[PDB]
Amino acid sequence: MAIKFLEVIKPFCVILPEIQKPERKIQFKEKVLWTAITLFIFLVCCQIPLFGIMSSDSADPFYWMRVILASNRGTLMELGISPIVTSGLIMQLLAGAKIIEVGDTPKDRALFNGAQKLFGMIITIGQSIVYVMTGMYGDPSEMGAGICLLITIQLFVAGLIVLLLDELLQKGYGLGSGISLFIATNICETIVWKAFSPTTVNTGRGMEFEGAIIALFHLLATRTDKVRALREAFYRQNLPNLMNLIATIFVFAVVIYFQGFRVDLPIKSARYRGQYNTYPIKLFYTSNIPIILQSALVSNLYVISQMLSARFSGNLLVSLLGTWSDTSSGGPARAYPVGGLCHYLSPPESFGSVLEDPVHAVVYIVFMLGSCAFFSKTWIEVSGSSAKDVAKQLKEQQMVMRGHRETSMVHELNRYIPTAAAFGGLCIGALSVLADFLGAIGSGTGILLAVTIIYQYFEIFVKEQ
Amino acid sequence: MDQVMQFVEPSRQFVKDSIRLVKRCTKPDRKEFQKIAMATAIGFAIMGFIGFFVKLIHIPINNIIVGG
């Protein structure tokens, strides 16, 4: 006899701002315009620095994480999409586990969406306060209570704005999902920036262009040893390399090739003779969502571990979760987990590190593949994309497989969809690991996310067109 | 060995099913791959170009706002 969790949250939902759904079906060009405007606002927020940060050259523990989360350090998007993803993951997992029973009624669905939003906002407030109190922007006593409050308010408002923009796009004002568009844009921007950045970084020997292409051209023009300068550009230790860019291009092509793999099931309209369609079961049936869920879970684990280590030094549980050390080895400060579970979860930086610590690399690979396969299987059940649900969608669409009853369709789909999901998740994890080992610019996870998001946006665009 | 069999049999079935899936997967035709790659490249170029320009414009703004 549990009082409904949604009923408990219902009074708070009224305070939550909710975007009105469009009364009229929006024109395709107008949807494109809305998507462009929302993206432009998101990019501006991504570039605007937070007010009152004290300039600390403190290590970035989350540099790999920020690219996936569409977060930029020291900006209004420092939190990025992490609260929204975390709240979605938690609420979906609770629904799948049946701890929270969501009724089919619109009131229950509306409450479920409001609860997920409310959790996202609560997480945004908690994370912003946590980041201010952890000294990421400087010591709280030195910054002062007023600055800390201002930063917390700014982060909360930025997260709320992002949540509203995502709602606006999802509700059909724009194309696709705002979270997906933001992630894809962030990754594309980061890769293009590293390729073409004109900024000069003062390496101890000399001022070196950050952008791999610009540095290559400058070195070739300025150096008598053109071959040596080219080799240095290919194998630079401190800045993005041309070889890394080539590796990224190779990964991008490989990912597209695997993305194209599909199993075509012949479907006929039962009502109308001669209409032949194929239902494509893609190899990556579950999309980037297994990656997103795995990365969000790992990100939350890292945040919790770094907080526990900062606040409760020397406790056995804290050491088990993670020990962080800031390694300023001739580079911008980076906080690496040197012990605990977080160390095993962290990607090895190079083949050399894999050779030095083979156990860590094996554990990381096994964890990534297992987690991706598990998340893919769970996601299909939670998402309503199971063979039964697809068969229901086909019955609603009056599409019937030739010679097979609608019940038969479920059995045939059930043969492929679970296998496709688990194998696709394993393949995605393997591709991510391979790209990370190859050192592709923008990260193996980032490149996979960008390619698949772009492909799904292109499919949406073609379908609408 | 029963515990080992209990772990091996699901994995062995999974490998067999994966082989079946790959065997029935239609591999993309070269024209289809080229079309997909071109569309993805265009989307990547557009988003990266917009982000790069926005960042470049903000950097002088962010050096006046924060630098001083």
């Binding site: 009105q20 927020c45 620095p49 007010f51 704005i161 509203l164 | 706002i65």
Partner: peptide, 29 residues
């Protein structure tokens, strides 16, 4: 809340952050 109000609120917040930066510079100077 309408989409246009959401956009207006986002733009106002961005402008407010810029104003806060300007005021902070004036107070420091």
């Amino acid at each position: 809340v309408g989409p246009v109000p959401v956009l207006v609120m986002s733009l106002l917040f961005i402008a407010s952050v810029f104003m806060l930066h300007i005021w902070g510079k004036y107070t420091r100077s």
